[PDB]
Amino acid sequence: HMASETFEFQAEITQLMSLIINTVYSNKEIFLRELISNASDALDKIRYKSLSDPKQLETEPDLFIRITPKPEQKVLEIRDSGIGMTKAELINNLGTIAAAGTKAFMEALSAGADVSMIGQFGVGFYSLFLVADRVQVISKSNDDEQYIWESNAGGSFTVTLDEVNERIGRGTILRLFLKDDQLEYLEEKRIKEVIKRHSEFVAYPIQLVVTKEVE
């Protein structure tokens, strides 16, 4: 299905995104920690669900977080083999449920809270807009087909049955279209340094996919 469906963001999420995408906050690298955390949580959920439904793991037995720079497309992908999101979950989780939390965080920001507190308000996902101006969330839950949720921080987002990306057995890819001045997050050394600042207690392998010219 090449036909996409369009949806409106809850207004507070739109407000949050505009604040993030436009902030001159200095520590943009915090986004990586927040996405790895979300990835870790999605993995926790599938592991926990598998405790009483082991077959849930069979669509992708390896549990991992994988980071893939795609320098030519100025894209950075953060992939997990976690629980994934059905179409309805994408619509719900990314476009509505975060509303209240985004409002609480915005008030904190207004009072002077550090943007790095975002995950403590349960809305760390949106920190991707610190470094990206557009994102595709590609997700495959055991309970649905593979779907693409796409947002450019504007008030609307689309969901499209996925007929263009690699099949993921199960889980989620955040495909960040990096801003032109944030291309340092395509670089292996930079990515490694940022990850190491907070990767100490991640229970899952964090894989970096590096493209090396032979010789």
UniProtKB/Swiss-Prot annotation:
Disulfide bonds: none
Residues annotated to bind ATP: 34, 38, 80, 85, 93, 99-101, 120-125, 172
Domain of life: Eukaryota
Intracellular or extracellular location(s): Cytoplasm
Effect caused by changing G82S: Reduces client protein activation activity, leading to growth defect at high temperatures
UniProt induction comment: Expressed constitutively and induced by high temperatures dependent on transcription factor HSF1. According to PubMed:2674684, it is constitutively expressed at low levels, however, due to the specificity of the antibody, this result is unsure.
Subunit structure: Homodimer. Interacts with the co-chaperones AHA1, CDC37, CNS1, CPR6, CPR7, HCH1, SBA1, SSE1 and STI1. CNS1, CPR6, CPR7 and STI1. Interacts directly with the substrates GCN2, HAP1 and STE11.
Family per similarity comment: Belongs to the heat shock protein 90 family.
Free-text note regarding domains: The TPR repeat-binding motif mediates interaction with TPR repeat-containing proteins like the co-chaperones AHA1, CDC37, CNS1, CPR6, CPR7, HCH1, SBA1, SSE1 and STI1. CNS1, CPR6, CPR7 and STI1.
Other comment: Present with 444943 molecules/cell in log phase SD medium.
Name used for this protein in its record: ATP-dependent molecular chaperone HSP82
The species this protein was found in: Saccharomyces cerevisiae (strain ATCC 204508 / S288c)
UniProt lineage: Eukaryota, Fungi, Dikarya, Ascomycota, Saccharomycotina
The gene coding this protein: HSP82
